[PDB]
Structure formats: C-alpha cells, structure tokens
Design a protein around this ligand. Structure first.
Ligand SMILES: Nc1nc(O[C@@H]2O[C@H](COP(=O)(O)O)[C@@H](O)[C@H]2O)c2ncn([C@@H]3O[C@H](COP(=O)(O)OP(=O)(O)OP(=O)(O)O)[C@@H](O)[C@H]3O)c2n1
Length: 252
C-alpha cells in the first residue's frame, strides 16, 4: 500500500514472539524473576494497547504489566542515560557496576521495539505506529517508556549516575526521557547526588563540557530539588571502558 495511517515505523516483526522470548530469557537468567509467568506478562503487555486507539494510551493501561514486572533494583547503583545507550550498556555489562533501565525485565522486554494496535480490532499494526512528534505523544511506545522510566527513577537512592552525550548540541535535553521524566521523579528524600558523566565524541583534546550551558541548567534544576549535582568529563570513552575492564592496569 502506497500510504499508511501513521508516520512512524509499524510494530516490530514477530513482536509477540520477540517479547515472549525475551521474557523467557530474562527470567531464565535473573533468579529474582524466576517465578514470573511470561505468558501472563505477554497478556498484560498486550492488554495495555490491543483494541485501543494508539493515540489514546494512558499510564493506567500499563498497570497490569507494571505489577507483573515489579522488581527490586539496587537503589544506589542506578545508571540513567540520555542518547548514548550503547556505552551505558557496554559499561554495565563489564561487571554490573551499575543497572540501567534495560537491565530490568520491563526495559529488557521493550528495548528497541515498536508496537501499536487499532481501535476496535484486536490486530497488531505492523504497517505504521504513531510518531511522537508528528502524530501523538500518548502512543503505546512513548507511554510505556514514560511509565517505566518514572518508576525506575523513583526507585533510585544515594548517588545516581547519568551518562550524557557530549557530542550533541544539547548535552542535557529537557525534552528527553531523562530530562522530562527521570530528573523530576528522583526522590530528594532518598537521592543524595546526581552525578553526570559527560561522554565526549570529539576525538582527543576537548573542552570542559561540565561547563556547558545545558549542564548548568541541569545543575540548577537538580540543586533546586535539594539534590547535589556532580559532573565529570569522560574524554575518551574507549579508554574509559578499557579501564573498567582492566582497572589500575594501564594508563588509567
Ligand atoms: N531503551 C530505551 N529507554 C528509554 O528510557 C530511560 O530513558 C533514558 C533514555 O532516554 P532519553 O535519551 O530520551 O533521555 C534512560 O535513562 C533510561 O533510563 C527510552 N525512552 C524513550 N525511548 C525510545 O527510544 C526511541 C527513540 O527515541 P529518541 O529520543 O531517540 O527520539 P524521539 O524523542 O522519539 O524523536 P521524536 O520523533 O521527535 O519524538 C523511541 O522508541 C523512544 O520511545 C527509550 N528507549
């Protein structure tokens, strides 16, 4: 068909099979999730968006799935990220120094996937799904991430870290999930500090990007929530990862 209902990519091929298989793998690997019934998880995930208008999804739609995906995360070891998920993930993969959202069952189930249904049919839409900008923000994927990211941020305590992409024109972006949801849902009663790691993309010698106006904005916002702010440059992410794998080892 030469045209489609929405402007975004349609549901990821074999979405039901993919989510199911991810749930099985996760609960097989992660002991604490060992009892989880992956069929019930799939059904609850389905229940959030099937037969529903994909511009009319709410956080409530995802509550059955949230309940089933309830999981304790070590509160002082949370790593948030904005844009640069590959480094964040490569980092936590070394020795589980920290946990990102994609290390939780629910984040793992949905990572890199697109999905939506149709009002008044039970069909998954494999042709297109709403674009957040062009179509609607209350779509199944955007609403899912907002809901799960809020919960993840509320679970954090002590020092919370965030990797930010220093090669972007807005290192801290208030419109991102990190900036619009996570920063506002850290609980000042529990969270002592937010420490930003600003990942350089520019090769070799570069600025102190902790002085970037958007970082100063982030500092102001966090400080005004009664949370301390710290910032560090990571000048060579490749060296950084090497030092994580082999610390004190070289020129670290
Ligand atoms: N794996 C993952 N984790 C998310 O969430 C937490 O959110 C943070 C990262 O999101 P951020 O980069 O937006 O801050 C991390 O701290 C995680 O703890 C996501 N929050 C949103 N997404 C999804 O990432 C995909 C690309 O989004 P984009 O931010 O690159 O571009 P977008 O804002 O959707 O462009 P638009 O068309 O103008 O709306 C979309 O599927 C979007 O729904 C997400 N994907």
């Amino acid at each position: 068909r030469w045209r489609q209902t929405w402007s975004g990519p349609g549901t990821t091929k074999r979405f039901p099979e993919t989510v199911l298989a991810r749930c099985v793998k996760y609960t097989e690997i992660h002991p604490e999730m060992r009892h989880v019934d992956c069929q019930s998880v799939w059904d609850a995930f389905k229940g959030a968006f099937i037969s529903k208008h994909p511009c009319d999804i709410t956080e409530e739609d995802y509550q059955p799935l949230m309940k089933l995906g309830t999981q304790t995360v070590p509160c002082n070891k949370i790593l948030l990220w904005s844009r640069i998920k590959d480094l964040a993930h490569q980092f936590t993969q070394v020795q589980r120094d920290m946990f990102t959202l994609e290390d939780t069952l629910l984040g793992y189930l949905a990572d890199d996937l697109t999905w939506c249904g149709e009002f008044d049919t039970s069909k998954i839409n494999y042709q297109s799904c709403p674009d957040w900008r062009k179509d609607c923000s209350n779509n199944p994927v955007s609403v899912f991430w907002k809901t799960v990211s809020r919960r993840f941020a509320e679970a954090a305590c002590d020092v919370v870290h965030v990797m930010l992409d220093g090669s972007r024109s807005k290192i801290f972006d208030k419109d991102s999930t990190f900036g619009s949801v996570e920063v506002h849902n850290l609980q000042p009663e529990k969270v002592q500090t937010l420490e930003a790691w600003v990942i350089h993309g520019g090769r070799e010698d570069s600025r102190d990007l902790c002085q970037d106006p958007t970082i100063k904005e982030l500092e102001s916002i966090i400080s005004k929530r009664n949370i301390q702010f710290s910032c560090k440059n990571i000048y060579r992410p490749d060296k950084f990862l090497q030092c994580v794998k082999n610390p004190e080892d070289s020129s670290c």
